[PDB]
Symmetry: C2
Subunit: 155 residues, 2 copies
């Protein structure tokens, strides 16, 4: 039954939050703001498979910039351009989302123009001055991937 | 009935081609490759509402570059930077799609990393050496907008 697969795909899609879809921060490929885009660094980036990479300074949860790998397609490793030169040039804005955010809201935000890598946060009320704890990242491609896997659109 | 709305939304989504979703070329906001990003030009761009703009040279159907308005957020009108400086710097690659392409295939292409503005073509076999006729453009946001309008994801 085509219609039951559609229904069941949609029902599952609708129950998902960004927290279910995100890459946890511990698992994310990330890069220090002081990085130099020499061969070893760019090889590691290219070999990671990620196309959107958070840039942190000091602590991994301290994300200060984004790096979009497709923007690196024309950077030459042999010139060792500082990442800071790249990131300060583009200055792409940070996009934060609540861990309970549903995928429809996520779509709506990417459609409004917010950055295609979003940083997932929850409120942490357990240390000592409550803070927003960075849990992981979610990208445009992660959400599109859930839609394709849902098979809702499959002819 | 929640399930019937889902089914009917999906059935409609699935029947759509990029041709149904595209902005026709005649209706598109476009910009000449020789443009200077002075105030009048940037005002016109900002007032258009478009965030992705095809760059043409000579004829409107001769699209040679893309301009992403969010990349203009930090360009200063008073410096009159040539568009060519901007476009030759970024050099974003052109993405062409067949007019019969369905939305699931479209998603899959954007997810593979192809440019988020796609140029819709069909084969024109009526002039004189058949050529691919540019019909319009379709963006990431147009497809996301069809998904949101389908209400498939609505809680």
């Amino acid at each position: 039954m085509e219609e039951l697969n559609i229904i069941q795909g949609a029902l599952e899609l609708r129950t998902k939050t960004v927290e279910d879809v995100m890459t946890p921060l511990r698992d994310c490929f990330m890069i220090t703001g002081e990085a130099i885009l020499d061969f070893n660094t760019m090889s590691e980036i290219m070999e990671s498979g990620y196309t959107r990479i958070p840039v942190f300074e000091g602590e991994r949860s301290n994300i200060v910039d984004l790096l979009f790998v497709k923007d690196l397609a024309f950077v030459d490793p042999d010139d060792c351009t500082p990442l800071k030169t790249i990131t300060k040039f583009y200055n792409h804005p940070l996009h934060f989302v609540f861990n309970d955010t549903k995928l429809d809201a996520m779509l709506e935000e990417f459609k409004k123009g917010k950055s295609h890598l979003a940083i997932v946060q929850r409120v942490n009320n357990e240390g000592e001055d409550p803070f927003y704890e960075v849990l992981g990242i979610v990208t445009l491609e992660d959400v599109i991937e859930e839609i394709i896997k849902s098979e809702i659109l499959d002819e």
